[PDB]
Design a protein around this ligand. Structure first.
Ligand SMILES: Nc1ncnc2c1ncn2[C@@H]1O[C@H](COP(=O)(O)OP(=O)(O)O)[C@@H](O)[C@H]1O
Ligand SMILES: Nc1ncnc2c1ncn2[C@@H]1O[C@H](COP(=O)(O)OP(=O)(O)O)[C@@H](O)[C@H]1O
Ligand code: BEF
Ligand code: BEF
Ligand SMILES: [Mg+2]
Ligand SMILES: [Mg+2]
Lengths: 417, 417
């Protein structure tokens, strides 16, 4: 008796099971209400019920166990967590809790937690003694997260160009700067697919705030990982809540020496949401940005770091420029002094239908020698010195024509000499 | 005895009928008052009266049935809908209701609804069980909505250029960016005529907010569809109300697997109206735009989506640029990074009296391979690569001179090779 197991079951089988259990007509009923009635009827027989979810401690002291399939939205099937157990096990926002639950009695509206069985997918004896995320020693990117497929596919050209322009390692904090209508969607899809193919052990999390739902359901059915999104039909409060829950879960996972990867596509939208939810202080800067509005996105971005004791946190955010709004322009670069990695995309190259439209000149990675060998770094330096004199479109055409001849970049580097 | 039937009748015949029924002199009376008196006299004999309209639920709990011929304006002949029936049939704003009505008794001012016969042009048993619009899975444009006439007319050149620049499919969410005095009116007229000619099965709705009455009555007598407009003589409150009613009706139609097409021509004017009706919060951004003013137009724009279960919602809004106001430059923009189709028009080409004055270079459609075949996409790519080096005016002249030689674009593509 698990909550996620009943959530994954279809509607027809749940209706059939409820009709066999002998309850009210479930055809004219919601799936969540059907599951609730089935759990009630199964607990009336004396059997136990189990559930799971991410903890969201409220300001009063209690909390609930949000579900991932609903993008951490307030649902009727949330498991109530008393503050006594929180104080007894030192629980915090983001801790994954899995234990026995019971249906609400007369006068209650949510399931109660009796005994916790597993904390953060581990024993509670290992979670009671742990080092906080704020005390971990940061470090630079040491492990190399190669994005090249290696299967010789035609779509691998984007990953090869990305590796030649800006290699990505564990704990990297980069930025994907690109004007609208440049190809950010396809680039993010390719990055997510390459991450899921090359490094399936890492925890991939794609955050899409204030996006077109069709794109949400497309990304959810395309990438092999977790997708937490919030369409534009929701207020900025839900955006802030989702961002906080995601970053808290990422911190709790990193605290257990896990490799978390966050592919953010709405850093600008997140900053707009934070500027909308912040109370007015009577002081407005140039472009309509509050003085204390960028602090929360600043911390959300700076949360990414590489841990020496174990694990890492990678955050790749895509910033929006040339959107016609001065607020986004002020945000983007305020954040430019940030992202230890900038991958610029050119609109002029995208208009020529030359995919990918990557600005190789302005791209780059700091401390790239820690992720590449000596000969590889020398070859990349020679390639950059050869590409720099040529124009952007000409350099892109040259790179595409030279990478189409071979499958691996090593052969291209060997033929360049 | 139908309301719309009496509304379509002329004034002279209604006056004659009222004089034959033996009532007060109807020559010095309004047509609506004449219809009201005729309905009263016909109901005094014991016969039944029927009406219809779009439901507009008020904040208190009751509602009225607005009429389409009055642009959903508050009229004396609105049918009152009690909240009891709303609670009994789960009615919402936008549901088309058609049932028996009765004249108001002593102390009443509006017609009452006794029994509902048809809901959303369908049986109530099919409307009681339905999936909300917020739960439908979005998708990209799959079905091709070809705009080419095919009759070899001289006006078909605009549709041919539009198809070669940006093909339109079901569920598309585009933008027509053009400075003033460019030819937006003729272009919108041609688009509406091509939609009514090629795809007469789709529900066409043209929304004109804050425009001149002459243009309104011109569009109403030119296109073959529904025209809901609101001239500048009305406050922004009526603009917001009309936009809400139109989008709610569109959502209710899409919920019944219908293909709705909305040709918006005032996205900038709608954003200005929303910025005017929003209460001041003491925080003004660059250009005079409120922080929470663009949220409602953002949702109105993002409502457009393609449904996998059935139906679609297409919204083609025309944004205004270079109007001398910085608010529109932020308002029209901020919207640039939202849609997935931009059809730019050049003022320099319009000054040369070269119609249509379309910027073929900056135009385009994302995921265009889902609406065109392989050979068609290759021919469009070759045409774009040939047109790109030439200047805007030169490319437009070349395209016009090459399309004037033949009737179909297939012959042009075959002759280009
Ligand atoms: N690698 C690519 N190959 C082919 N087309 C692409 C590629 N990247 C982008 N595009 C085109 O650009 C359009 C928009 O790209 P997108 O990633 O949505 O840009 P952004 O996210 O910056 O708005 C897509 O619909 C696609 O047709
Ligand atoms: N396809 C066309 N053919 C001929 N003239 C046109 C065409 N499109 C626009 N025009 C001219 O431009 C004028 C204004 O066009 P309009 O569509 O009103 O531009 P906008 O809507 O951008 O203000 C029209 O009065 C018309 O004379
Ligand atoms: F319009 Be893109 F997604 F920035
Ligand atoms: F003056 Be146009 F209608 F933008
Ligand atoms: Mg995008
Ligand atoms: Mg116009």
């Amino acid at each position: 008796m698990n909550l996620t197991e009943l959530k994954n079951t279809p509607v027809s089988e749940l209706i059939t099971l409820g009709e066999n259990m002998g309850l009210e007509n479930l055809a004219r009923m919601r799936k969540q209400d059907i599951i609730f009635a089935i759990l009630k009827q199964h607990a009336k027989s004396g059997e136990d019920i189990f559930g799971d979810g991410v903890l969201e401690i409220l300001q009063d002291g209690f909390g609930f166990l949000r579900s991932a399939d609903s993008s951490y939205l307030a649902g009727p099937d949330d498991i109530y967590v008393s503050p006594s157990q929180i104080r007894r096990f030192n629980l915090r926002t983001g801790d994954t809790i899995s234990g026995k639950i019971r249906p609400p009695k007369e006068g209650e509206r949510y399931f109660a937690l009796l005994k916790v069985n597993e904390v953060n997918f581990d024993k509670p004896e290992n979670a009671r003694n742990k080092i906080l995320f704020e005390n971990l020693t940061p470090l630079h990117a040491n492990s190399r997260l190669r994005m090249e497929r290696g299967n010789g596919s035609t779509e691998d050209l984007t990953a090869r160009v990305l590796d030649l322009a800006s290699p990505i390692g564990r704990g990297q904090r980069g930025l994907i700067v690109a004007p609208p209508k440049a190809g950010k969607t396809m680039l993010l899809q390719n990055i997510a697919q390459s991450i899921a193919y090359n490094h399936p052990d890492c925890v991939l999390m794609v955050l899409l705030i204030d996006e077109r739902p069709e794109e949400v359901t497309e990304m959810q059915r395309l990438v092999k990982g977790e997708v937490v999104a919030s369409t534009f039909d929701e207020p900025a409060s839900r955006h802030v809540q989702v961002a906080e829950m995601v970053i808290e879960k990422a911190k709790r996972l990193v605290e257990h020496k896990k490799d978390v990867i966050i592919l953010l596509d709405s850093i600008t939208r997140l900053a707009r949401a934070y500027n909308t939810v912040v109370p007015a202080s009577g002081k407005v800067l140039t472009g309509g940005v509050d003085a204390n509005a960028l602090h929360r996105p600043k911390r959300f971005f700076g949360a990414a770091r590489n841990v020496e004791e174990g694990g890492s946190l990678t955050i790749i955010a895509t910033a929006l420029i040339d959107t016609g709004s001065k607020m986004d322009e002020v945000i983007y670069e305020e954040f430019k002094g940030t992202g230890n990695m900038e991958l610029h995309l050119s609109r002029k190259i995208a208009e020529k239908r030359v995919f990918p439209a990557i600005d190789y000149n302005r791209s780059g990675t700091r401390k790239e020698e820690l992720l590449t060998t000596q000969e590889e770094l020398q070859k990349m330096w020679i390639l950059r010195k050869i590409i720099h004199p040529m124009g952007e479109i000409d350099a892109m055409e040259f790179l595409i024509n030279k990478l189409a001849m071979t499958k691996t970049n090593d052969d291209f580097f060997e033929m360049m000499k």
